[model samples]
Target: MELWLVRHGETLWNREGRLLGWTDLPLTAEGEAQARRLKGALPSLPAFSSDLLRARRTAELAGFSPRLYPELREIHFGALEGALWETLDPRYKEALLRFQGFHPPGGESLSAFQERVFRFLEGMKAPAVLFTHGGVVRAVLRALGEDGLVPPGSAVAVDWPRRVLVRLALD
Candidate 1:
C-alpha cells in the first residue's frame, strides 16, 4: 500500500530547537505559509492525521479533511515535552540523535513508538495521506531502512513496509 506521510509545519518549539511531542503548539507564520504551499501539491486521496491541532490544520490547508487518529501522534514526550534539544542530558540526547535506545523520562520508548506507527500502517486498507509529526515521519522512514529526516512542511511517500517512493520539500 502507498502511504504519504507529511510532517507538519514549524511550531514555536520547533524553531527553538526543542523536543516537541504532545504539547500541542500552533504553527508559526512561516509554518502556515509552508503549509499553504502544499495546497495542491499532494494528491487527493483518503487522508488521516494526528489528532493534534497542528496536524489537523495542515491537512485542512492541504485540501483534505482527514480522519483524526491519536495513533498518528508523535511519540508522547511525556515530561520531556518542550525540552530544549541542546543542553539535554547526553543519554537522552544521544538516543534522540541516533533514533534508538530512546526512553524519555515519562515519555514513550523508541521501540513502542515504532510499533504503534507500524501497526497503524499495517491496518491501512488503501493508499492515503497521513498528516503528522516529524518523529512519526522519521519512524516510518527509518523502518524502511532509510535515513529518517525531512524538513517541516515536507512529505515522504513509501510502499508500506517496503522502500521509499519519494520525498518532497517546498520553499
Candidate 2:
C-alpha cells in the first residue's frame, strides 16, 4: 500500500522556532496557503491527521476530509510543550541533542514513539495521506529502515509532506 506522510503547515511556533509538542495551535496564513497548494496538487487522495488542530486544519485546507487518529499524534513534550527550545534547561537540550537515543524527562522514548507509529502502519490498507507531526514522520521513515537518511520537514516526491514512504513488493 502507498502511504503519504505530510507535515502540518507552518504554525506560529514554526515561524518563532518554538517546539510544539501537544500545544495544538492553529496554522499561520502561509500555512493555510501551503495546505491549499498541497490540496490542489493531490486531488485524488483521502487525507487524515493526528488529533491536533494544526494538522486537522492543514488537512481540511488541503481538501482532505481527514480521519483523526489519536495514535498518530506528535511527541508529548510534557513540561516542554510550549517552552522555547533555547530556553529549555541544558539537560533538555542535551536530550534533544541525543534525539533518537535519549528520552527527555516526562517524554516518550524515541523507540517507544517509533513503535507506536509502526503499530498504526500495520493496520492500514490502500493508499492514504497522513498529515501529522515531524516526530511521526521520522518514526515512519525509520520503520521503513531508512534509519538516518531523511530529516523531518523534508518531503519526498511521492510522499509530498515528509519523505517517509517505502515501497514494499509482494512476491
Candidate 3:
C-alpha cells in the first residue's frame, strides 16, 4: 500500500530554529493555516498520526480522524530537546557530527526508533496518510534507501520532501 508521509506544519520552535526532538510543540497560526490548506487538498484516505501534538494537530486540521500512535512520534531527544544545535555543548555537537546514529544522553537510539516505526508500518494495511515529524520521516526514508531527512514543516510523498502526491503501483 502507498503512504502519504506528511510533516507537521510550522511551530514557534521551527521559526526559532530550535531542535524540537521529542518536545511537544503547538502550532502557530500560520501552521494551522498550512494544515487547513493541506486538508483542502487531500483526497480522503485512512490516516494515522504520531502521538506528538504537532502531528495530531495536523491530522485534525487536515480533517482526518487519525489513529494516534507513539511508534510514529519524533525521536526521543532527551537532554537535547529544546536546545538549538549551536547552543548544545560543543562536545555533544562534535559527537553528533561524528556519529550519525548517536543518541543524546537518555534518548532513544536510531535503531530503537526504527523498530517502533517499522511496527507501525506492519500494522497498517491500507493506503494511509501519516502525520509525523521530521525524524520519523527520516527514519522511514532511511529504511526506503533515501538520504537527507526533510526538516520540520516540509512534506514528502512516498519519495521526497514537500511533494504533494504520488501514485503507487503493485506491478
Candidate 4:
C-alpha cells in the first residue's frame, strides 16, 4: 500500500533539542506555518494521526480530520521525556545514535518501539496519510533501508516495505 508518513511540526522541546515522547506539546508559530505549507502537498487519502496534540494539530492545519490512533504516538519516553539531548549519558546517547540497544530509562525499548510502529503499519488496509511523530516516520523509513531523518513537518511517501516515493519539506 502507498503510505504517506508525516512528521509533526516543531514544538518548543523540539527547538531545544529535548527528547519528546508523549509530552503533548503544541506546535510553535513557525511550526504552524510549516504545516500550512503542506496544505496542498499531501494526498487526500484516509487520514489517521497520533492522538498527541502536536500530530493532531498538524493534520488539521494540513486539511485533514484524521482519526486519532494511540498506536501512532511517539515512543513513550518515560523518565527522559524532556531531557536535553546534548547532555544525555554516553550509553543512552550511543543507543539512540545507533538506533539499537536503546531502552530509555523507564521507557520503551528500541525493539519494542519498532514492534509498536510496525504493528500499526501492518494494519493499513489501503493508501492513507499518517500524521505522526518523528520517531514513527524514522521507524518506517529505516525499515525500508533509508536514513529516515526528515525535518519536522515534512512528509514522506513510500510504497510500504519496498522503497521511498517522495519527500515533501518546507522551511
Best by lDDT: 4
Kindly report the root-mean-square deviation of model 3 from the true structure over all alpha carbons. 5.3
lDDT of candidate model 2 versus the reference: 0.68
Greater-lDDT candidate between 2 and 4:
4
- State how far residue 113 of model 3 sits from its true place (Å): 0.9
For model 4, residues 40-159, the per-residue Cα lDDT tens digits are 999889999999999999999999999999999998888999999999999989988888898777889989999988899989989999999999889888889989899999999999
Candidate 1, residues 1-171: lDDT per residue as tens digits?
A: 999999998888877888888888898888888889999999889999999988988888888999999999999988788888887889988888898898877889988999898899999999999999999999988888999999999999999988999999998
Residues 90-171 of candidate 3: C-alpha lDDT, one tens digit per residue: 7767755543566677887766777787787777777778888877776666666666366444556663322334422110
* Poorly placed runs, candidate 1 (over 4 Å): none
- TM-scores of the candidates are 0.97, 0.79, 0.82, 0.98
> Clashes in model 3: which pairs?
155-162
Quality of model 1 by C-alpha lDDT? 0.90
Q: Between candidates 1 and 2, name the one with more favorable TM-score.
A: 1
lDDT by residue for model 2 over 1-171, one digit each (tens)? 667777777788876778787887988887777777665555366666798988888788777888899778888876677778778888777866555564656877667776777788667766778778877765665544565333222233234223544432111
